[model samples]
Target: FMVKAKSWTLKKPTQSDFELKTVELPPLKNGEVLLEALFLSVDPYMRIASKRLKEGAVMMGQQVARVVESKNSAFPAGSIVLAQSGWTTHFISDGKGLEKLLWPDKLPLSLALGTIGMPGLTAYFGLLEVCGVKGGETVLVSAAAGAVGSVVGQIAKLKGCKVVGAAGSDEKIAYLKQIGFDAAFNYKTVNSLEEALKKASPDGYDCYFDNVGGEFLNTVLSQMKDFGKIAICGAISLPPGPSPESIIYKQLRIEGFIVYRWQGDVREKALRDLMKWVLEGKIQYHEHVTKGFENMPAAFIEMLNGANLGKAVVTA
Candidate 1:
């Protein structure tokens, strides 16, 4: 007759900011289905968004959920859906914002929240559409070991661009190299990022897929080839200073995207393409998984601090 749902909530970006609340779900109504959260992703964008979250708001997130009970004609029990259901463990929906998994049996269901999901779409659209990289072009990605950045590097390689990746650790550098990056370096260990960039591609970068934009952006701007492109994805590093002289002299083109621009059929097509690549081993995925729903806050903070090498997810 009822379901009790547990939710984690926050109003700020502190470990103690989270509050776990429990509520009972009334009996399902007509056209309504009960959803149980399965896998959830903890991403960088949420850190900036958290500041805008009002008190008592269920911490915002998307999840791969299962229909536990249903009265809706479209969704039956045992069906899986992707939902923007926040951080709750269970919820009753009137089928308003649920998405069909469209999942391949060979792929892990959790990927619906990562490479085959929003992050992958961002990489695909931002790299090809915004950067417009060409064959033999030198491509550089900051934070290149992250979910979006990692996909950008691999996709650039597949498109015949010479890919360069800058990660935080030596281990990530190794992983980037293993994933077919033409050059990979630990940005934290390097004596100078500009020197590292110059060494990676002595000529200059034709395309830069920037996730960490601050000092890195300033340094990279000076190393851009004439008429080069830069796609601003996430500014985890935030706040910038790319000299106006460099922008004018190099004739750089820069654009920022949030990845919802392509939807419906276009979105589906890209998802299918990403899936195809994973199946063919063209794009490899790695997840830093944290088990248990209660640890969502910890996992989020861990990811915020760059503790995750690839996609960060929590399983309820």
Candidate 2:
């Protein structure tokens, strides 16, 4: 039997640059599986990554899919898996790239696309490995209400550090505070980010987990304590660019990383720790789920515009 899939294509670089198209999938072969997507992730990095993909290429993304038909014993029919299936309703996969979910019933399967998945791992490694945050230290994060930033703040608090966050909206600021951020502010509303930083972190920040990296990064650089550390995870608010020169004089340490770099033993250890914390109610996660496959472009664009409060996922 043939599978009918609807996929998104990148038409251009503008906000409304995606086009939807239909394609027919060939029957599965030996060692292959047919996957039906349950949830698809839309993240900020896609906006930048799309520039490298050829025009009309299928939109690149990760999804939580279910195996409907399988020729591979490792992933039997009805098994839930995580795959880089992009923005499609159905796709074919060789068992090679798919990761079978071991605890589907213990948590929402959609989380495999969010907190329990890449975003969660990003926060874990970015803070613990890249930033080397220590207890009783102070931490500052940008885009604090978004998926990665929210987790960074909460994790720092759990480690006994004072956490401060900067988000775009008053509502997001309030939510950050409710989630245990020692201080949070609407970066858009602030008269001066440096003043706000000084108010929130009177002694200066020991670690900075930066997501928005333009003038904000420069301002943060001026406030970092000597020998402080910075983990650069994203540059949503800034054009793709360089770190400010102030880091040199301050003797600061900075590292830019992608989460997948830590994907072997480090990933396994982090997933286990995150799962335990989540089950025990020490960590919380939120998702902004869009309800249909056809709305993938809208969801993606909205997320890029900072309209989503947390991880943005589309249910297919």
Candidate 3:
């Protein structure tokens, strides 16, 4: 039997670009499995990565998929898996680069693409490994409404630190508070970010989770406490190195990271702890799930505009 898959291919709309087209897939061969998308990720990082993909290539991202028909012994039919299959309704895999989902039953499968997925992993490792909080320390994070930033705030709280977040909207600020951040602010309308940061913690931050690393990073650098650790996770604001004097005088530690740095045993260990915390409600997750595969671009664009409150996922 043939599978007619609907795929979102990138003609790269100067980045607003994706064209959906149909392609026929041959019947599953030995050791092959068929996957249908349940949830697809729309994250900010995709914007940078999307630039390099060949024109007409499938818009790149991972999805929570299901094994509908499998010839592979490793993945049985009816199993749910995580596949980097892009924005598509259906695809084939030979078990390469596919991860089986073993999530708690009550949690949504969509989380496998969100808090329980790459973004979550990004926050978990980036904080623990890079920032290495010592508890009771004050922390600051930018883009606090987005997936990675949200988790970073919560995890800092769980680790016994006071968390501060900067977001573009009042609603996002409220969500950050609900998720247990000690203080959160609307960086968009603030007359002065430095005053806001000072008011949040008079002594200044001991750990800074830098997501929007342009001028925001520049301001936050001077706010860091002596020997403070900073995890440079994203450049959503896409630029800068602020005060060399502050970096030297404060003796700050800054490290940019990718989630893949800890893998296999360490990665699984973090996932287990993350799942436990999630199941325990210590880490609450919110998803802005856009329905319909056809609206993938709409969801993608909205997420890029920071309209999503938490993790952004497209239901296919």
Off by over 4 Å in 3: 13-16, 238-241
Q: All candidates' TM-scores? A: 0.97, 0.95, 0.97
lDDT agreement with native, every candidate: 0.90, 0.87, 0.89
Check candidate 3 and list the clashing pairs. 13-16, 13-17
Model 2 spans > 4 angstroms off: 13-16, 102-106, 238-245
lDDT of 1 by residue, 89-113 (tens): 9999999989986466988888888
How many backbone clashes can be found in candidate 2? 0
Mark the 10 consecutive residues where model 3 has the least summed lDDT: 10-19
Ranking by lDDT: 1, 3, 2
Of the candidates shown, which would achieve the greatest TM-score relative to the real structure? 1
Candidate 1: 10-residue stretch with minimal lDDT: 8-17
- Tens-place lDDT digits, model 2, residues 146-171: 98998898889999999999998988
lDDT of 3 at 101: 78
lDDT of 2: 0.87
Give the local distance difference test score of model 1: 0.90
The positional error of residue 152 in candidate 3, measured at the CA in angstroms, is: 0.9
